[PDB]
Symmetry: D2
């Protein structure tokens, strides 16, 4: 009843179509992904939503989603803050591999666990591997110890919260209308916190792609209600 | 001397109002389709010659902001921080903003507009605080004190408004070792160049910065230009300067 | 005066006496410390702010020890040590060029008595400039390593000081006030005269008569548009009249 | 073992409650006169060895903040930016804060407190939101979401609360080439050290950081410790370690 927060998950990426684990792989949006953001922007525009600051991960797919939304809402003048803390969950040694070839290699049960589990991460990369963010110039200014070799949702949540408490939440408290453009697991991290969901309950939480999720929060940042801005 | 640092400046391409032959100033109009493509072309040239960036500075006007995004996209630099500031905005055209050039030329005279357009210290007629074109009435600038928001501006004012941002943000980034990109407008960039090259008040009037062409500055240890150049062959560049 | 209310409250304070104020010597950007009396003026200003219940959310200071320590002392005495403090060379004292470090008598005998009165009280006539080879030039000082040399003065008149202060007002101080933050500004005589000149829309001629006393909180009650509704010092009319005379 | 960066850590000296033999935690108590002087002495040692700083990090508790200012004053480094954060605060002692050791011994028992004091993952009894010692009720933390403010903490929680600040601010400054100073507390510094030296959960329990003594870390290109040392002779240092034992 006091503050309004808008969250959005980027649309389909090239690897979502190629049926391959992405994680921190910095792949671009597919043409369909680019358009989901254009549609979400129009809906926000129609309802008169406006923003004062935007937060994003550092992955192209989220960054472009955010730019598209600002463009479609006439909010290109606002500051945009990116952080690796809003990045998708890192899939370790599975990143870049096709899901079928990994399912046939490791088994259908084991991948379902790695995909939908809360605290069991996929096999870790080695520091010599090029998929390790520690070897990527994009993370040059981030200490290597903070860059994951692999992650379970749990790790993702713990890595996201600090950014919520140190940047996002304070902006809301300062009176700013905030937009957050991120990924499925990163956003599940925020929602888990916002709605105080249990470890078991977030496993069933599915955040649809390219649909604005609006949170009406009270004076103490507790949700009064939430809803998606569409009719599909 | 020799280059120690590299700075890249870029002026946004054509806007809808450039085609509609209308004074823009702080009017937040979008790029035309041709303007969007000039940025794509400038990105490729930067990509080809191996330019990379660590931070990007922009005005708060859509035109420049989108030009910047396009260049980062085309150079695979979408991960970098982007900082916007009203200080990099185009020169404010006062009471002329939104008016067609022919209709103002016929109203006020061909001489008087030429003065207001290419003069250094004579600004166009000022707006009143009641006018909606005054940034002080625009929510975009709600966090900026109204005293800093112009009613009108001459190039001189624009230069004075830009320098502080150069000294407080852009230059320090260069000094910190960061490869900087600046996406702004004609007059705001003339402001930086005037300072960089220590141009006189009279000389900057002849300075014409072509639209959608990266301008690269090789600076020494003390931020003084060793040389500058545009990323385009003499053929394409000659045609861009003439427009 | 105006009977309206304050929307915002801003507190400005000029640091107390420095070692060189006693040595009767031009300081400018020379980073000299406060005298023991200077340290105590800040303790007294803190107590007055404490008694009236003033609280702060952020503090702005120059990068000169003198102002910095004044600010720390005030935060300590008001139980505001938890707030962010932002420093900037833009709030530095006016730079006195080639006069910095010299005694008044020895500069008066060297350059002339009246010429110094002009350099000290004038608005637009600066003192003789330093050379880039001189150590008193901030461009050679590690303290300003991250600030482009072109921005660092060789000398300054009040006018120059005002022009370098304003941007910091518009880019940091004012926005904090607009965000709803109770701001404290600990700086120097000329830098504060710069802010006041702007706040009260004073003329070039009028700011020459403006004397800001040392170690006395100056409170500004500003309206929604940052225009002064009224201002006042936290001191009895007795101690205050004596502070202004100095 | 090739050092590149230098980091200086300092634990504030004695507080009024250290003398009054009482659990402090987030209680914002001031330094004792002896505490103020330890910082003056640490500043002189840093001054003598020529240490200079480019930025300083601190908790938001007066005792640490004043320690930092004193060190900057004594090293002629008052011009540098100082960033404070609740993330560097002392460990929060939950329901034990404000209690005297005798008063806690009489009301919680000698065994339970020894566990709460030297344990890694078992926190002291938690406060209720209706308790005034909960930071959520303190204006100092007005700009920090209440969900982040502890009701109680074990060293483990402290560590988890500190790391993000290390990775988001302190470390990047070191990587940017800045000479950093960190003025904080016993448990918050044990957090950093535990990470820096990759100490095990069991080993940090024996780690004792003396008060008012600069701790210098020589780190390699990848922020890994090459070596560390205190600015004090083995004689004066032996006596400081016994004080903190
Ligand atoms: Na890295
Ligand atoms: Na405004
Ligand atoms: Na410098
Ligand atoms: Na709070």
């Amino acid at each position: 009843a006091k503050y309004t927060l808008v969250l959005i998950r980027h649309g389909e990426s090239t690897w979502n179509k190629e049926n391959r684990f992405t994680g921190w792989t910095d792949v671009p949006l597919s043409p369909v992904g680019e358009q989901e953001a254009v549609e979400a922007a129009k809906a926000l525009k129609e309802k008169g939503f406006e923003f004062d600051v935007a937060y994003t991960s550092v992955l192209q797919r989220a960054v472009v989603t955010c730019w598209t939304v600002l463009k479609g809402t006439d909010m290109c003048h606002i500051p945009v803050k990116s952080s690796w803390r809003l990045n998708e969950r890192h899939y370790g040694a599975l990143q870049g591999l096709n899901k079928a070839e990994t399912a046939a290699k490791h088994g259908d049960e084991q991948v379902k666990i790695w995909r939908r589990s809360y605290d069991i991460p996929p096999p870790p990369l080695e520091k010599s591997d090029k998929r390790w963010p520690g070897n990527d110039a994009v993370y040059k200014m981030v200490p290597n110890e903070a860059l994951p070799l692999t992650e379970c949702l749990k790790d993702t949540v713990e890595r996201v919260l600090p950014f919520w408490f140190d940047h996002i939440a304070p902006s809301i408290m300062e009176g700013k209308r905030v937009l957050v453009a991120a990924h499925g697991n990163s956003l599940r991290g925020l929602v888990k916190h916002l709605d105080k969901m249990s470890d078991e309950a977030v496993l069933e939480l599915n955040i649809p792609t390219g649909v604005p999720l609006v949170y009406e929060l009270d004076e103490d940042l507790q949700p009064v209600r939430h809803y998606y801005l569409l009719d599909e």
